[PDB]
Amino acid sequence: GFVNKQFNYKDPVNGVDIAYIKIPNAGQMQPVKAFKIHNKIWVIPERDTFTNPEEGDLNPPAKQVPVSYYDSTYLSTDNEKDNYLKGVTKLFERIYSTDLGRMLLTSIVRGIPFWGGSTIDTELKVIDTNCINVIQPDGSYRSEELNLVIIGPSADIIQFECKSFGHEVLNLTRNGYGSTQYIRFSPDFTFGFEEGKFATDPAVTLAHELIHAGHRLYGIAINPNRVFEVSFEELRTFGGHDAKFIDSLQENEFRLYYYNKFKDIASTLNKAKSIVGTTASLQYMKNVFKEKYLLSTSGKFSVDKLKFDKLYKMLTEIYTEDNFVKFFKVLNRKTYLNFDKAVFKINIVPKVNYTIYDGFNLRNTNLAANFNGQNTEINNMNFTKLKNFTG
Ligand SMILES: O=C(CCCN(Cc1ccc(Cl)cc1)Cc1ccc(Cl)cc1)NO
Numbered sequence: 001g002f003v004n005k006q007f008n009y010k011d012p013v014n015g016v017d018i019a020y021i022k023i024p025n026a027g028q029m030q031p032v033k034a035f036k037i038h039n040k041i042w043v044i045p046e047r048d049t050f051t052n053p054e055e056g057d058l059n060p061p062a063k064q065v066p067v068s069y070y071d072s073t074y075l076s077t078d079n080e081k082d083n084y085l086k087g088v089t090k091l092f093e094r095i096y097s098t099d100l101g102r103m104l105l106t107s108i109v110r111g112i113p114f115w116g117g118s119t120i121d122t123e124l125k126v127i128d129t130n131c132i133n134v135i136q137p138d139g140s141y142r143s144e145e146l147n148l149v150i151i152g153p154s155a156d157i158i159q160f161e162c163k164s165f166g167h168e169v170l171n172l173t174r175n176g177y178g179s180t181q182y183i184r185f186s187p188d189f190t191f192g193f194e195e196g197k198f199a200t201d202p203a204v205t206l207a208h209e210l211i212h213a214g215h216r217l218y219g220i221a222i223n224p225n226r227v228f229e230v231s232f233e234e235l236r237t238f239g240g241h242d243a244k245f246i247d248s249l250q251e252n253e254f255r256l257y258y259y260n261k262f263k264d265i266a267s268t269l270n271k272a273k274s275i276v277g278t279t280a281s282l283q284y285m286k287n288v289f290k291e292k293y294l295l296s297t298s299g300k301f302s303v304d305k306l307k308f309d310k311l312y313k314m315l316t317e318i319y320t321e322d323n324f325v326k327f328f329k330v331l332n333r334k335t336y337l338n339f340d341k342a343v344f345k346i347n348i349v350p351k352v353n354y355t356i357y358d359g360f361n362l363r364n365t366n367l368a369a370n371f372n373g374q375n376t377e378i379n380n381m382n383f384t385k386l387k388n389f390t391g
C-alpha cells in the first residue's frame with residue numbers, strides 16, 4: 001500500500017528510512033528516532049517539545065473549549081512509540097484505501113515547498129526550514145528535503161494541528177511557496193460527540209490535518225486572522241454546511257489571489273539561471289515545480305486557468321473532512337465547533353478493534369449497523385472514558 005514497510009520502534013537505524021534526525025527548530029536539540037513511511041513523509045513517535053521550544057513543558061496550565069487532556073508520561077515508553085507508529089501507519093493506509101484519500105496523499109507528496117531561499121532572484125535554493133538533518137555513521141548530518149512530519153502531541157494530548165516553521169520575510173503558507181508541515185496528532189485518543197454517544201474516527205481527524213497540510217504545502221492557506229470565533233481555514237477544512245459560511249465573493253478574492261501567486265512563481269522559474277545544491281539539476285527542479293503547480297516547445301512556464309481552478313478546487317473543496325466522512329462511511333459531528341467535552345483512550349492497532357476498511361464499524365458484526373462501532377456505550381471496550389481537564 002501507501003506505507004510498504006511495517007516498521008517497529010525497536011528496528012535498527014539504517015540511515016535511509018530509519019534514522020536519528022534533528023528538525024529545523026533553530027535551537028540545539030538531541031536527535032530523535034524518525035521513520036520515513038513514504039517518500040517525503042516522516043513520522044516522529046515523540047511528544048512534540050521540538051517545533052516550539054517555548055512549549056517544551058508537558059505539565060498542564062484549563063482551556064474552556066475545546067475539551068483538553070494532559071498526561072506527562074504518554075508517549076515516553078518504546079512500546080507506546082511502537083504502537084503510535086503502527087497506529088499512524090494504519091490511519092495512513094485507511095486514508096489511502098479511499099479514492100479521495102489516495103488523491104490527497106498524492107497531492108501532498110507532489111507538494112514540494114518552493115526553492116525560494118536565495119538572495120539572487122535568478123537563483124533557486126531550498127529553504128533550510130523545509131529540510132531535516134539526518135545523522136550519518138560518522139556523526140555528521142546530511143540535509144534531507146521533506147513535505148510532511150507526523151509528530152506526537154505537545155502538552156494538551158488531544159490538541160491536534162498542522163503547523164510549520166516560518167520565514168523572516170516570506171509568508172510561505174500564503175504566498176504559494178508552501179513549507180514543510182508538522183502535524184501534532186495521536187492515534188491513541190479520540191473525541192466523543194452527540195447525535196446517543198459516539199466517538200470520532202481518528203482517520204477523520206488525521207484526514208482533517210492532512211487537508212490543512214495540503215493547503216499549506218501549496219501556499220494557499222487562509223490567514224488565521226480571518227475569522228467568523230472560527231477561522232475561514234477551519235470552516236473550509238471541515239466542509240459541508242460550515243464551509244458555506246464563507247461567502248462567494250471572499251472565495252473568488254482568494255481564488256484570484258492564488259492564481260496571481262502561482263503567476264509570480266511561474267515567472268521566478270522563467271527568470272532562474274542558476275541552482276544551489278549538488279544533486280539539484282535546474283531543469284529537474286523546474287519540472288518538480290511544473291508538476292506541483294500543474295503549469296503549462298521553448299521551456300517557458302505558464303499558468304493554465306482551467307488547470308489552476310481545477311487544482312485550487314481540488315485542494316479547497318474536494319479535499320474536505322465532510323467528503324472523507326462520506327467516503328469512510330462513518331458518523332461525525334455536524335459542525336466544526338463542538339462543546340460535548342468527552343475524551344476516550346483508544347487502541348486502533350489490533351484488527352479485532354479497528355480495520356483499514358471498516359474502522360470501528362466492523363462488518364458482519366453487531367458494530368457494522370447504525371455506527372455501533374463508534375457507539376461508546378455499545379462498543380464500550382474500544383473506548384475508555386477519561387477525565388476531561390478541569391484544573
Ligand atoms: O481543527 C483543529 C483543532 C481541532 C478541532 N476541534 C473542534 C473544536 C471544538 C470546539 C471548539 Cl470551541 C473549537 C474547535 C477538536 C474537536 C474535534 C472533534 C470533537 Cl467531537 C470535538 C472537538 N486543528 O486543525
Ligand SMILES: [Zn+2]
Nearest residue numbers: 208212234237
Ligand atoms: Zn483544523
